[PDB]
Structures are given as C-alpha cells and as structure tokens.
C-alpha cells in the first residue's frame, strides 16, 4: 500500500512540469503580442514615419 | 510563428526539508527564454465578447 501510494503521488506531482511548460508557453506568448487592431495600420504607414 | 522564441530548460534540483515527522519534497527546475525574431512575431485578436 505504501509503495503504491508513493508511485501514485510521484505520478501526481512533478509533470505539472509538462503541463507547466504548456502553461508558461502561453503565459509568455501573451505578454508580448500586441492586439491586431493596433498593428494593422502601423505596418501600412511604415517608412513614411517621423 | 514557426519559431517564436528560444527556451532553455535546466536540470532538476531536489530540495530537502523536514517538517515534524511529516516530510515534504520541493522540486525545482530553472528556465529561460528570449524572443528570437526581430520585429513583432505574435498577433492577438480578441474575437468574441
């Protein structure tokens, strides 16, 4: 029972690294992507700026 | 994008600590990330409400 117990919480706690990497990917991709609305014109008028 | 950003995984540490006859492991893995592309390389829509 104790050994089954270990195996199980093992297989319960640390792959939340796999889920956690899947999380961090989105958490990073979000904080650097501007909204399409503020970006579609910004490329159109590019070059003639300043 | 096809490769938006680099990403560096570390080797997993295993911190110890005792707590009153009940013990508790503490796993840890350091990471890193830099956006490889120059210029914006990730869009955003806000489709629905």
């Amino acid at each position: 029972r104790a050994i089954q117990q270990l195996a199980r919480n093992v297989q319960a706690v640390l792959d939340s690294f796999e889920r956690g990497t899947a999380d961090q990917m989105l958490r990073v991709l979000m904080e650097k992507a501007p909204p399409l609305s503020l970006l579609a014109p910004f490329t159109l008028y590019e070059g003639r700026l300043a | 994008e096809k490769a938006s950003e680099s990403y560096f995984m570390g080797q997993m540490q295993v911190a110890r600590t005792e707590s009153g006859g009940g013990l508790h492991l503490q796993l840890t893995q350091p990471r890193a990330n830099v956006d490889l592309g120059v210029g914006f390389t990730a869009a955003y829509a806000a489709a629905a409400l």
Partner: peptide, 23 residues
Amino acid sequence: MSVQIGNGLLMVVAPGTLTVGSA
C-alpha cells in the same frame, strides 16, 4: 560510542535522486 547511525543517517542519505520529475 559515537560513530555512524546518526553519522549512519549522515552519510548515506545517498541512493534517492529522482524524487521523480513528473506529475
């Protein structure tokens, strides 16, 4: 009368490295 079952404990905490990496 002083050496190695707490100096027991002490050295070979050793054969434990996974404390697995997986949830």
